């Protein structure tokens, strides 16, 4: 789906479907009034009948009107004469996109310049959200349906703005396209079943990506190299599986050579059975989304690759399959981490932090200005912050402050949890430097505490996306692509773009 920006009058442009907003009590703003006049008052005449209340996202569809160049006109409600909230705005757009998806229209024109969005500027912010909701809402994962699905009609959507703001709208389109494309890659990887989507499969994907872009080199470290580096924790996790582990390094050099890089570390547990500390059966299929941390890294890279952003970015994907078997790790195993700290593995289902901890030690060789790890780490985060808000912790306030502020602008929000010292004692072990679990209280936090012990060489934040990376049921069961919008926004901020 192509998305473009033009500065012509709404009435003038030839199209399968023209879309304009209507407020409560039949209130037409400037753009919409011009279309009414140009349609010889056909639009205000139908509105007099009361079928459209004007509530945000409500629609009434018209078919072609004399004096117009549009085959169809779609009236969408924009609510009272007030700024819309983010959420309300996005729902208005998806509701539009929803009527268009069911039309035999090859193209559509959105003439929604009169809608104001709250705390959002009228050209960039407004449309960043519209463009992202629209392109992300075309996402289809029909690849394992043996009935090849009916190919859609819609291929082109044009956005109309005034001349003055056109450049700013195009900047929003460019960015949202980048993010939208990164989210599709993320969602594809997340939705892919674990029999096909294993670490080696992920290794192959990184290599292919590396063969497609000039500024990106990829290096894959296998099971033996993981072990040889002294990554005892990473190795312990993966050893129980017939599919061996991979540590994938995706190095994009887009800034100056002396620029200290940004490092993204993503948990890539391609399936999580719990291991010997086996999970219950119910809903275990959703554990294919335990590599969504690694998937959000792929997607963020794919968007920056698209934007050719001027930064150095090193991606590290810690990938393993957590399986039970005759050679799997046992509860009670003590291993030596790459850092030289010893860890008693009291629960083999707290394995994300184990692969992550050696990878964080590994990230030191890059001398980063920031290291962010992204993981579907804890059940406790879902209890804490539910489905809507990413868990965020770090050893540097300004860095967490930056990530927080990026989420607010992307509309992909995080929320900070504290790493107080009182929480550290929960990881105490009678025998090793630390245990890998802190018990049933403060589960998101003690996981954060565990990781922080390995992130002391640099500025570091940690993102628990256990709640935000997929949807468990209903129609829209699947990966969401979060937090690609946040991380991409944070990198955009860093790039001054």
Which residue positions form the known binding site? 267, 272, 290, 349, 351
Count of positions on this chain that bind Mn ion (CB under 5 A) = 3
Decide if residue 306 touches Zn ion (CB under 5 A): no
Decide if residue 349 touches Mn ion (CB under 5 A): yes
Q: Residue 432: helix, strand or coil by DSSP?
A: coil
The residue among 107 and 272 lying less far from Zn ion, judged by its C-beta, is 272
- Compose the 341-380 pattern: x for residues touching Zn ion by CB under 5 A, - for all others: -----------x----------------------------
Site for a second copy in 253-312 (CB under 8 A): 271, 273-274, 276-278, 281, 284-288
- Minimum distance between the CB of residue 469 and Zn ion, rounded to whole angstroms? 11
Among 35, 131, 180, 197, binds K ion (CB under 5 A): 197
- Minimum distance between the CB of residue 54 and Mn ion, rounded to whole angstroms? 43
Count of positions on this chain that bind Zn ion (CB under 5 A) = 4
Long-range Cβ contacts of 170-174 (<8 Å, 24+ apart): 170/5, 171/124, 172/123, 172/124, 172/125, 172/126, 172/127, 172/128, 172/131, 173/3, 173/4, 173/5, 173/127, 173/131, 174/307
Site for a second copy in 1-40 (CB under 8 A): none
281: Cα separation from own chain's centroid:
28
Decide if residue 464 touches Mn ion (CB under 5 A): no
Q: Which of the stretches 90-98, 200-208, 211-219, 420-428 binds a second copy when contact is defined by CB under 8 A?
A: 420-428
Report which secondary-structure segment, H or E, holds 225. Answer: helix 223-228
Question: Which letter, b or e, does each residue of 153-189 get, where b requires 16 or more Cβ atoms within 10 Å of its Cβ?
Answer: ebeebbbbbeeebbebbbbbbebbbbbbbbbbbbbbb
Decide if residue 272 touches Mn ion (CB under 5 A): yes
Return the structure tokens found at 118.
């709250």
Q: Which of the stretches 33-41, 206-214, 380-388, 453-461 binds a second copy when contact is defined by CB under 8 A?
A: 380-388
User: Which among a second copy, K ion, Zn ion, none contacts residue 269 (Cβ within 5 to 8 A by kind)?
Assistant: Zn ion
- Minimum distance between the CB of residue 141 and Mn ion, rounded to whole angstroms? 24
The residue among 264 and 381 lying less far from a second copy, judged by its C-beta, is 381
Decide if residue 201 touches a second copy (CB under 8 A): no
Decide if residue 409 touches K ion (CB under 5 A): no
Site for K ion in 229-268 (CB under 5 A): none
Decide if residue 389 touches a second copy (CB under 8 A): yes
Q: Rounded CA gap, 162 and 184, in Å?
A: 31
What's 14-47 look like in SS3? CECCEEEEEEHHHECCHHHHHHHHHCCCHHHHHH
First to last CA, the chain: 24
Q: Residue 452: phi, psi to the nearest 5?
A: -55, -25
Q: Rounded CA gap, 305 and 298, in Å?
A: 10
User: Which among K ion, a second copy, Zn ion, none contacts residue 290 (Cβ within 5 to 8 A by kind)?
Assistant: Zn ion
Q: With contact defined as beta carbons under 8 Å apart, do 279 and 272 qualify?
A: yes
Among 14, 332, 367, 401, binds a second copy (CB under 8 A): 332
Return the structure tokens found at 146.
């043996």
Q: Is the peptide bond before 419 cis (omega within 30 degrees of 0)?
A: no
Report which secondary-structure segment, H or E, holds 390. Answer: strand 390-394
Decide if residue 192 touches K ion (CB under 5 A): yes
Return the structure tokens found at 354.
């184990």
Decide if residue 290 touches Zn ion (CB under 5 A): yes
Site for a second copy in 427-446 (CB under 8 A): 430-433, 440-446
Site for a second copy in 89-118 (CB under 8 A): 102-105
Return the structure tokens found at 442.
């403060």
Q: Residue 366: phi, psi to the nearest 5?
A: -95, -10
Catalytic residues: 279, 353
Residues that bind Mn ion (CB under 5 A): 272, 349, 351
Residues that bind Zn ion (CB under 5 A): 269, 272, 290, 352
């Amino acid at each position: 789906m192509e998305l473009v920006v033009k500065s012509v009058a709404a009435a003038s442009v030839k199209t399968a479907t023209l879309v304009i907003p209507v407020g409560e009590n039949r209130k037409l703003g400037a753009v919409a009034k011009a279309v009414d006049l140009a349609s010889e008052g056909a639009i205000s005449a139908v509105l007099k009948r009361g079928d459209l209340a004007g509530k945000p996202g409500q629609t009434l569809l018209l078919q072609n009107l004399q004096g117009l160049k549009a085959e169809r006109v779609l009236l969408v409600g924009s609510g009272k004469d007030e700024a819309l909230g983010d959420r309300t705005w996005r729902k208005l757009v998806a509701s539009v996109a929803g009527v268009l998806k069911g039309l035999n229209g090859a193209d559509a024109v959105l003439a929604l310049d009169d809608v104001a969005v709250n705390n959002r500027d009228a050209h960039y912010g407004k449309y960043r959200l519209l463009a992202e909701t629209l392109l992300d809402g075309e996402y289809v994962f029909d690849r394992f349906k043996s009935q090849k699905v009916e190919p859609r009609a819609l291929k082109k959507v044009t956005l109309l703005a005034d001349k003055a703001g056109q450049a700013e709208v195009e900047r929003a389109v460019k960015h949202a396209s980048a993010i939208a494309t990164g989210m599709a890659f993320t969602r594809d990887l997340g939705n892919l079943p674990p029999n096909l989507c294993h670490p080696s499969f992920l290794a192959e994907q990184a290599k292919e990506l590396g063969k497609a872009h000039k500024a990106l080199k990829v290096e894959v470290l296998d099971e033996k190299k993981i072990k040889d580096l002294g990554m005892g924790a990473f190795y312990a996790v993966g050893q129980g599986s017939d599919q061996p582990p991979r540590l994938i390094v995706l190095n994009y050099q887009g800034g100056k050579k002396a620029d200290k890089p940004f490092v993204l570390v993503g948990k890539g547990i391609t399936f999580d059975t719990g291991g010997i500390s086996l999970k219950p059966g119910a809903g275990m299929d959703e554990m294919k989304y335990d590599m969504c941390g690694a998937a959000s890294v792929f997607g963020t890279l794919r968007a920056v690759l698209e934007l050719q952003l001027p930064v150095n970015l090193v991606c590290l994907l810690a990938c393993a399959e957590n399986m039970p078997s005759g050679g799997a790790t046992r509860p009670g195993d003590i291993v030596t981490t790459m850092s030289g700290q010893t860890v008693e593995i009291l629960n083999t289902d707290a394995e994300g932090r184990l692969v992550l901890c050696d990878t964080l030690t590994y990230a030191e060789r890059f001398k980063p200005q920031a290291v962010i790890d992204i993981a579907t780490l804890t059940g406790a985060c879902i209890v804490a912050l539910g489905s809507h808000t990413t868990g965020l912790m770090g050893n540097n306030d300004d860095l967490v402050g930056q990530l927080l502020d990026a989420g607010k602008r992307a509309d992909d929000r995080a929320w900070q949890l504290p790493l107080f010292d009182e929480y550290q004692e929960q990881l105490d072990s009678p025998f090793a430097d630390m245990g890998n679990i802190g018990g049933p209280k403060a589960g998101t936090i003690t996981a954060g505490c565990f990781l922080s012990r390995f992130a002391k060489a640099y500025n570091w934040a940690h993102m628990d996306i256990a709640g935000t990376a997929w949807i468990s049921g209903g129609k829209d069961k699947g990966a969401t692509g979060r937090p690609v919008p946040l991380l991409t926004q944070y990198l955009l901020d860093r790039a001054g773009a």
